Short mmCIF file of C-alpha atoms and ligand atoms in Angstrom, two decimals:
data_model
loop_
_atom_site.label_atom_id
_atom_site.label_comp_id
_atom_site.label_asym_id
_atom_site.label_seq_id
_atom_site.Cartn_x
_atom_site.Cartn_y
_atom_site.Cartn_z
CA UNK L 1 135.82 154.95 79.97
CA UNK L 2 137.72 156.26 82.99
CA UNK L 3 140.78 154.68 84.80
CA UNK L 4 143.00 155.99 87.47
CA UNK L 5 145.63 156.87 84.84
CA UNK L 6 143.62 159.43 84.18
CA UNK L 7 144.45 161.68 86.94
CA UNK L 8 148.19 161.60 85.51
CA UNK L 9 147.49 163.63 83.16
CA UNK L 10 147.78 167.04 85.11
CA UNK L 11 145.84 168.96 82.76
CA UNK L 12 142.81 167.07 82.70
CA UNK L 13 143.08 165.54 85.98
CA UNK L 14 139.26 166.21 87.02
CA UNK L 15 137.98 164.59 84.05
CA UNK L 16 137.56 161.28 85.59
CA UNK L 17 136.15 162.38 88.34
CA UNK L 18 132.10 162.16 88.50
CA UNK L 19 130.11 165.29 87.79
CA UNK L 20 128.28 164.54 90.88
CA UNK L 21 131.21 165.12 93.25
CA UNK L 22 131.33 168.50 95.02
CA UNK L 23 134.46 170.43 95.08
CA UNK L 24 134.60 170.26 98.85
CA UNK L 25 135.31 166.55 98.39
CA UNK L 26 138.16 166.64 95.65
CA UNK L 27 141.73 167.26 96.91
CA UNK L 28 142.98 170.12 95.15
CA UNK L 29 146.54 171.57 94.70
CA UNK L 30 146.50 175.22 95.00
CA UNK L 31 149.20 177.87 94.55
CA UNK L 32 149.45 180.40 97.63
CA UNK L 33 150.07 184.07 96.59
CA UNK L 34 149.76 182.97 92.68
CA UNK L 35 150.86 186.20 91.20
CA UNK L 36 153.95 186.73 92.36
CA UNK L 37 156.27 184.81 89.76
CA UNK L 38 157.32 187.87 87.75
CA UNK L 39 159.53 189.26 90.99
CA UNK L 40 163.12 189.54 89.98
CA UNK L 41 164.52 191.70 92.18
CA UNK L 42 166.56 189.69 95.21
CA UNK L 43 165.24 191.57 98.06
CA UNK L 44 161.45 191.56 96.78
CA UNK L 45 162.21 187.87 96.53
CA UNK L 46 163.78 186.56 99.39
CA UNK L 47 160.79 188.53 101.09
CA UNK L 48 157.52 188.39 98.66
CA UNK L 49 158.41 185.55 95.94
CA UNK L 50 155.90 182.60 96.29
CA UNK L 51 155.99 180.98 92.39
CA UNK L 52 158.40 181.04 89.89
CA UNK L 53 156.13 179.76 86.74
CA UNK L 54 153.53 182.02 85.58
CA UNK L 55 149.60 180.55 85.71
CA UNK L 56 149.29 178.54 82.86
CA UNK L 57 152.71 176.60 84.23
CA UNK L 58 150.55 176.09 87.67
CA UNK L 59 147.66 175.12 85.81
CA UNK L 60 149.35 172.76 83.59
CA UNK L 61 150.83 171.24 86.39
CA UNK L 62 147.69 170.16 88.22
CA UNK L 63 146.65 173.55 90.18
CA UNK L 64 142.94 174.24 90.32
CA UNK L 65 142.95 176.61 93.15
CA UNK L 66 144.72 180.26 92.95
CA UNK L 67 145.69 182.59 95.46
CA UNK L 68 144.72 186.01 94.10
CA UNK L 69 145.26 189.23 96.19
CA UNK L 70 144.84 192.33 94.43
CA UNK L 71 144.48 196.51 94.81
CA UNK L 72 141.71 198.63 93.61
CA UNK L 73 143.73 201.38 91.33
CA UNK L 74 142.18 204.99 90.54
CA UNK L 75 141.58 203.40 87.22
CA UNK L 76 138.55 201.33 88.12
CA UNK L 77 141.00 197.89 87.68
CA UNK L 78 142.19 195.50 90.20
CA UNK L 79 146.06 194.44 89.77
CA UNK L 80 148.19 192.02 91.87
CA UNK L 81 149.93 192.88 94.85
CA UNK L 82 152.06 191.42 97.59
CA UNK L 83 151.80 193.37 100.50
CA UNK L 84 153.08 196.67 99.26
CA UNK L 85 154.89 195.77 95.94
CA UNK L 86 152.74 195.21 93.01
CA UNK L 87 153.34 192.15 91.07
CA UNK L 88 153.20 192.85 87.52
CA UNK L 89 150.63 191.39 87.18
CA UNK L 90 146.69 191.94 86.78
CA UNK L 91 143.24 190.83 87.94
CA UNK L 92 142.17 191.13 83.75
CA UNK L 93 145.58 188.80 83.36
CA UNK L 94 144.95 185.89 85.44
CA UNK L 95 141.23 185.47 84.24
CA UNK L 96 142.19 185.33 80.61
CA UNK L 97 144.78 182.40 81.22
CA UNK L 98 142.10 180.58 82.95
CA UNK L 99 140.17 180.95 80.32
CA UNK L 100 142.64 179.47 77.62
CA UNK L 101 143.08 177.11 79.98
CA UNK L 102 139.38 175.92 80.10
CA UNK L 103 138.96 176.31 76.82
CA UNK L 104 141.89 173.75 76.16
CA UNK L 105 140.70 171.76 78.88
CA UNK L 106 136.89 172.31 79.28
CA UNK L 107 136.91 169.10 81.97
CA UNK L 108 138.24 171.37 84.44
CA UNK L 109 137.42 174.29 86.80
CA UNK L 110 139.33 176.76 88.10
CA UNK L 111 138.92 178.04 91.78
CA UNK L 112 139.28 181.54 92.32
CA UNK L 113 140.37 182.69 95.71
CA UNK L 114 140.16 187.01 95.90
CA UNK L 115 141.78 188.74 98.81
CA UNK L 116 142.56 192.36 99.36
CA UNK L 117 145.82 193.08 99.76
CA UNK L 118 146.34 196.58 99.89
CA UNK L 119 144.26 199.83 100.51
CA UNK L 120 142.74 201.22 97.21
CA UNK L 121 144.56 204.15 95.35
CA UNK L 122 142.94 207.46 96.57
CA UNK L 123 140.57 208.47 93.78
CA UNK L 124 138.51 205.37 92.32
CA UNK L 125 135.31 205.90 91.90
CA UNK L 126 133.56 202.50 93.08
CA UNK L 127 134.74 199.74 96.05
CA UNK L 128 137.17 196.79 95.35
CA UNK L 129 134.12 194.64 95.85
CA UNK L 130 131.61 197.06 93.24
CA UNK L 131 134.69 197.32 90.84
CA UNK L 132 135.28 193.85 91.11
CA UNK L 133 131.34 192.55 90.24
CA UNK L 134 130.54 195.34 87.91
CA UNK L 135 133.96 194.84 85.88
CA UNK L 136 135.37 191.55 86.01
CA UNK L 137 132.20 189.25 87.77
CA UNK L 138 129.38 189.95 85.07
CA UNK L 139 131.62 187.78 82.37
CA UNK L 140 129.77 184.69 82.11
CA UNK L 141 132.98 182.45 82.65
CA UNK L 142 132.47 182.95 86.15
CA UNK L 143 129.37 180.45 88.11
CA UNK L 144 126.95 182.06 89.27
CA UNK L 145 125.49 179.86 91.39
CA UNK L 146 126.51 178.32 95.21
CA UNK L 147 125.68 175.77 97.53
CA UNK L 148 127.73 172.81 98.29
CA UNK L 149 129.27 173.38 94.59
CA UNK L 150 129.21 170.39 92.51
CA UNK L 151 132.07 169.45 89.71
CA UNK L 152 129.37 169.14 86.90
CA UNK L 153 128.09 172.45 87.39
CA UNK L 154 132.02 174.02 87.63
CA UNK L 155 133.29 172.46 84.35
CA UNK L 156 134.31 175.27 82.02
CA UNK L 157 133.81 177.97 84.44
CA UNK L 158 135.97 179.57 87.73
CA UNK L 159 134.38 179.09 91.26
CA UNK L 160 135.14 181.96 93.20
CA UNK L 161 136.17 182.04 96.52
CA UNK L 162 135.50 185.53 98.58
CA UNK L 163 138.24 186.99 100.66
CA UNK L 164 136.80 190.28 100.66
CA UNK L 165 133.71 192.14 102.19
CA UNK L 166 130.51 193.93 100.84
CA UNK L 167 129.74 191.30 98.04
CA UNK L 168 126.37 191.71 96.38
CA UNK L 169 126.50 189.55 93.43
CA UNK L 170 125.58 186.06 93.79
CA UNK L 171 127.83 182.86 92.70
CA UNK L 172 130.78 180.73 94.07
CA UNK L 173 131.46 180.40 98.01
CA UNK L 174 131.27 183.30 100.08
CA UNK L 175 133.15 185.43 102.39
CA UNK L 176 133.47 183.90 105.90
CA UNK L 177 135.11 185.37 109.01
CA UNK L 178 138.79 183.92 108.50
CA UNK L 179 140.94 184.98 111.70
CA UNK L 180 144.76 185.81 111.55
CA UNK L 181 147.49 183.44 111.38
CA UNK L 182 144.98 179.77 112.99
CA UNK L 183 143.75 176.85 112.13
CA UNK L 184 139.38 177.49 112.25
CA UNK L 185 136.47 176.07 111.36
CA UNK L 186 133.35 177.89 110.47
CA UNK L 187 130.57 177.78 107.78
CA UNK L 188 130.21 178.51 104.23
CA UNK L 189 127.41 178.97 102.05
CA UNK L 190 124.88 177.85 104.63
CA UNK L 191 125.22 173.91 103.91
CA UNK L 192 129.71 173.75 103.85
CA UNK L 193 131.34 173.54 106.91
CA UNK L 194 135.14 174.60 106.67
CA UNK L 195 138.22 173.57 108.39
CA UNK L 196 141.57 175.97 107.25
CA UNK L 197 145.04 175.79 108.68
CA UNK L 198 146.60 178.65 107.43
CA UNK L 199 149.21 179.40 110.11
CA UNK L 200 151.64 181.76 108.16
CA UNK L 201 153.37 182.90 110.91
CA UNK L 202 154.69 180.19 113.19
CA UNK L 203 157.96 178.29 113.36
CA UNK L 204 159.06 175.61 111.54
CA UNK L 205 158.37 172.79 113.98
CA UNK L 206 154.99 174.00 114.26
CA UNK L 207 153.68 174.44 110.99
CA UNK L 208 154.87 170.91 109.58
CA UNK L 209 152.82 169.55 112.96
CA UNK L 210 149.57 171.58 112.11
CA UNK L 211 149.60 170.63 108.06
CA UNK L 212 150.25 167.12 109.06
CA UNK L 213 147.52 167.42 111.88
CA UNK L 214 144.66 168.80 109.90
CA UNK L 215 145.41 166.53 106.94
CA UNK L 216 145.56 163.92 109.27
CA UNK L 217 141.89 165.13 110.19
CA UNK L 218 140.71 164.87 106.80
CA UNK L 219 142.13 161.36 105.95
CA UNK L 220 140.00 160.27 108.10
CA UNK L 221 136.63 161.97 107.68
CA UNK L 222 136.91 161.02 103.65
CA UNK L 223 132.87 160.62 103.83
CA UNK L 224 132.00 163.85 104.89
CA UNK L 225 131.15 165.56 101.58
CA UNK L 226 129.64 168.90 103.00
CA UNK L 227 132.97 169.54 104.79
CA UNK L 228 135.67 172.09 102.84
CA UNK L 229 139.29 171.32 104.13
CA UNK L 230 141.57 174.17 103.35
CA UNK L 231 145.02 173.51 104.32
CA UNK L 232 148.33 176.04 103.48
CA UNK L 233 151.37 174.53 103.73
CA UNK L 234 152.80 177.88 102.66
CA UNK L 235 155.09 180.09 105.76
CA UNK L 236 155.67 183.79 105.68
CA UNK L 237 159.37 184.83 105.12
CA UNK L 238 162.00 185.37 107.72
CA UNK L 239 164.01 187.52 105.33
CA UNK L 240 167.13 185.30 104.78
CA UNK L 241 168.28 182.50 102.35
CA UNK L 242 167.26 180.12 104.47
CA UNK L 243 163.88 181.04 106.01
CA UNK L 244 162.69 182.19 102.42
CA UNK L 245 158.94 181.17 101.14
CA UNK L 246 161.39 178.82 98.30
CA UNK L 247 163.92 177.40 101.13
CA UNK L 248 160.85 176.56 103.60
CA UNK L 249 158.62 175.20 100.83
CA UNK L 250 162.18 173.09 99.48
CA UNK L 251 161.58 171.00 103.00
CA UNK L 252 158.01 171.30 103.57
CA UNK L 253 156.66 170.28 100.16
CA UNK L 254 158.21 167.11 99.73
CA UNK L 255 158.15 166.08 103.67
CA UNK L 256 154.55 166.54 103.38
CA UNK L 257 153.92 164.75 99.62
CA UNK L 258 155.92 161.58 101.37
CA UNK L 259 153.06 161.55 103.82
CA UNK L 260 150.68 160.88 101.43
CA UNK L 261 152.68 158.50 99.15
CA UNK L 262 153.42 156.35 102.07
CA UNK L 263 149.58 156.35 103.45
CA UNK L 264 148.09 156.21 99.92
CA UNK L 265 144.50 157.76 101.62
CA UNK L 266 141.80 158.90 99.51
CA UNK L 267 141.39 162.65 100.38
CA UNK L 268 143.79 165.26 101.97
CA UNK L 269 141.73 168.01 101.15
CA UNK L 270 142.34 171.55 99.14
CA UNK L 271 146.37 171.64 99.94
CA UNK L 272 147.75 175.26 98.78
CA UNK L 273 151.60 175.59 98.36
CA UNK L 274 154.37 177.99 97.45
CA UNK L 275 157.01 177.37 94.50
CA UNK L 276 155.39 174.38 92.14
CA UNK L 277 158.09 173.03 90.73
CA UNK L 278 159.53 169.87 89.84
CA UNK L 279 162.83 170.31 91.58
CA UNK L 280 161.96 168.25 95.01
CA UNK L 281 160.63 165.20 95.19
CA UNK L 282 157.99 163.56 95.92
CA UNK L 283 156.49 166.56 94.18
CA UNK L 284 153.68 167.45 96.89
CA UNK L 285 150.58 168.72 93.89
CA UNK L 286 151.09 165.25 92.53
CA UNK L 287 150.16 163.20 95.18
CA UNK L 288 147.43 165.68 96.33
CA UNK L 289 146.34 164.51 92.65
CA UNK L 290 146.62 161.22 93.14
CA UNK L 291 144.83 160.84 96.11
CA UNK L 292 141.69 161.20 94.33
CA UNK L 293 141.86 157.53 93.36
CA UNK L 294 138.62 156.74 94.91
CA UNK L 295 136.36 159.12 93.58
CA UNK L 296 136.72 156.97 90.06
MN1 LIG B 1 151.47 186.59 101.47
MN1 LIG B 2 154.29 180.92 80.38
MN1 LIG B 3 131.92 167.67 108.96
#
């Protein structure tokens, strides 16, 4: 019926996994600042590129959890952006690979995370939160409903995750004050408390000791199934070959995977990385996988 095999296979990884398990639980891989794996030019990448593989790659390769910023255009449509460079990509995009992808792989759910990343173009008519509900929110892939979000209910459908202010649609987990460049804790959706580390902009020494402290955190509070760990293991860009999002995340990711292979625990929370690959080793998503073990 189900065996621990099971979570090899990276696109059906949640499959084993009870229906009665909420999300908050599972340890996810995530991809931080998704959509920006169609950069080519050198200076956009040394400075904005996160990805290489397009969404389906990510998806296919265990992520459950995307990183979507995006800009409100004149044209009533949200498209990617990375600060001020726009991505190539679109809101209308990433939603229609998810739903391939669930339609392939109807065991899974895809979590949503939408941010906004730039100001909206002078001239649209609505609010990146209106535009976003009344546009993109009424399709029925998306769950409508909240709470401590349960795996059963999220099969076949993408949990959102608000980044963004003025919601008035109901659904997914909502917007929460996040503060700039810490590790908080705060509450979500009444019943979820929520522990993030999402330090982008500290040195090196620093941000390997606060992913390796809050993870440390939720090894050992595996119980607590009304408690959301979010933890980036993503840093901002210091401009050069060698303090790029891809030359940080070479060190990071696998320093941080080894952790986990060597402790073999049985939750590390919702771990969101730059450049999913398989170039380093221990691949970091993998093990995240893995350490869901338990939960079978
Ligand atoms: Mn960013
Ligand atoms: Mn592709
Ligand atoms: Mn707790």
């Amino acid at each position: 019926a189900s065996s621990v095999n099971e979570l090899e296979n990276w696109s059906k990884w949640m499959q084993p996994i009870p229906d009665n398990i909420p999300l908050a639980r599972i340890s996810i891989p995530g991809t931080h600042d998704s959509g920006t794996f169609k950069l080519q030019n050198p200076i956009k990448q040394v400075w904005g590129m996160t990805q290489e593989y397009d969404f389906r790659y990510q998806m296919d390769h265990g992520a459950r959890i995307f990183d979507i910023r995006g800009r409100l255009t004149d044209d009533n449509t949200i498209v990617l952006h990375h600060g001020p460079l726009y991505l190539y990509v679109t809101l209308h995009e990433f939603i229609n690979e998810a739903k391939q992808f669930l339609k392939d792989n109807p065991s899974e759910t895809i979590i949503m995370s939408l941010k906004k990343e730039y100001e909206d173009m002078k001239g649209a008519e609505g609010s990146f939160s209106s535009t976003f509900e009344k546009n993109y929110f009424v399709d029925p892939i998306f769950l409508k409903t909240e709470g401590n979000i349960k795996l059963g209910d999220a099969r076949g459908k993408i949990v959102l995750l608000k980044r963004y202010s003025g919601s008035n649609e109901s659904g997914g987990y909502n917007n929460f004050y996040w503060p700039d460049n810490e590790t908080f804790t705060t509450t979500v959706n009444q019943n979820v408390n929520v522990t993030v580390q999402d330090k982008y902009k500290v040195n090196y020494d620093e941000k390997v000791k606060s992913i390796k402290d809050t993870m440390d955190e939720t090894m050992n509070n595996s119980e607590d199934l009304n408690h959301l760990y979010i933890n980036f293991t993503s840093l901002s860009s210091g401009g050069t070959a060698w303090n790029s999002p891809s030359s940080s995340a070479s060190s990071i990711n696998p320093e941080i995977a080894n952790d986990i292979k060597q402790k073999n625990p049985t939750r590390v929370g919702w771990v969101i990385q730059d450049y999913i690959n398989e170039k380093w080793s221990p691949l970091l998503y993998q093990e995240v996988i893995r350490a869901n073990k338990s939960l079978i």
